[PDB]
């Protein structure tokens, strides 16, 4: 059930999990919760999500609470600014340290508590 886009396969889960249990599922399938590195990938993801909320690979790193990608893609604060929902990340309840795709818009991301359960998206490279 993996979908193909620009050199990567993506798995849109049918069962919801916490952010970390989701990541562990992806890891068990030789993948990671997805990074987002272009407008075209953001568009593929939010369009495919079809208005449902999915965990993606966004999570905090370092003392300073900087956002990062679990697949180790360097996080580009400048180039990613256009991808959050207006007002996010807002760090609500001082307890939102993971990120999901929420709005079907280029401005799609929300920060949410890592222990909330949502559907999730794994990303696996194709290696010819
Ligand atoms: O408004 C953005 C905000 O939405 C969600 O927070 C909840 C809502 O704002 C609303 O239902 O009020 C709730 C109680 O105060 C609040 O929890 C979250 O998805 C949050 O991450 C987001 O920033
Ligand atoms: Ca939030």
**Got the DSSP string for 111-125?**
EE-TTS-BEEEEEEE
Ligand 2 centroid to Cα of residue 10, in Å, is 24
Determine which helix (DSSP H) or strand (DSSP E) holds 99, and give its type and residue range: strand 98-101
Burial class for 102, CB neighbours closer than 10 Å (0-12, 13-18, 19+): buried
The structural domains of the chain, with segments of one domain joined by +, span 1-128
Determine which helix (DSSP H) or strand (DSSP E) holds 101, and give its type and residue range: strand 98-101
User: Which residue's C-alpha comes closest to atom 13 of ligand 1?
Assistant: 92
Contact 16, 118 (CB under 8 A): yes
Taking alpha carbons only, the member of 94, 92, 93 closest to residue 102 is 92
Resolution of the structure in the document, Å: 1.8
Nearest ligand 1 atom to the CA of 89 is 23
Ligand 1 centroid to Cα of residue 84, in Å, is 15
Taking alpha carbons only, the member of 63, 50, 65 closest to residue 99 is 65
Ligand 2 centroid to Cα of residue 85, in Å, is 9
**Backbone φ/ψ region at 118: left (φ over 0), alpha (ψ -120 to 50), beta:** beta
Taking alpha carbons only, the member of 53, 59, 61 closest to residue 99 is 59
CATH number assigned to the domain with residue range 1-128, chosen from the 4 options 3.40.47.10, 3.10.100.10, 2.30.110.10, 3.10.580.10? 3.10.100.10
Ligand 1 centroid to Cα of residue 82, in Å, is 20
User: Which residue's C-alpha comes closest to atom 17 of ligand 1?
Assistant: 92
DSSP conformational letter for 75? P
- Determined by which method? X-ray
3-state secondary structure of 110: strand
User: Which residue's C-alpha comes closest to atom 3 of ligand 1?
Assistant: 92
Spatial neighbors of 60 by CB under 8 A, at least 6 apart, are: 66, 67, 68, 97, 98
Count of H-run helices and E-run strands, the chain: 3, 8
Taking alpha carbons only, the member of 84, 32, 29, 24 closest to residue 57 is 32
Rounded CA-CA distance 52/79 in Å is: 24
């Amino acid at each position: 059930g993996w979908k193909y886009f620009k050199g990567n396969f993506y798995y849109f889960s049918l069962i919801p999990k916490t952010w970390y249990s989701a990541e562990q599922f992806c890891v068990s399938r030789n993948s990671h919760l997805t990074s987002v590195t272009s407008e075209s990938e953001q568009e593929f993801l939010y369009k495919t999500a079809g208005g449902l909320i999915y965990w993606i690979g966004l999570t905090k790193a370092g003392m300073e609470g900087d956002w990062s990608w679990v697949d180790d893609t360097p996080f580009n604060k400048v180039q990613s600014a256009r991808f959050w929902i207006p007002g996010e990340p807002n760090n609500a309840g001082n307890n939102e340290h993971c990120g999901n795709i929420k709005a079907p818009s280029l401005q799609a991301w929300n920060d949410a508590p890592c222990d909330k359960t949502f559907l999730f998206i794994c990303k696996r490279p194709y290696v010819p």
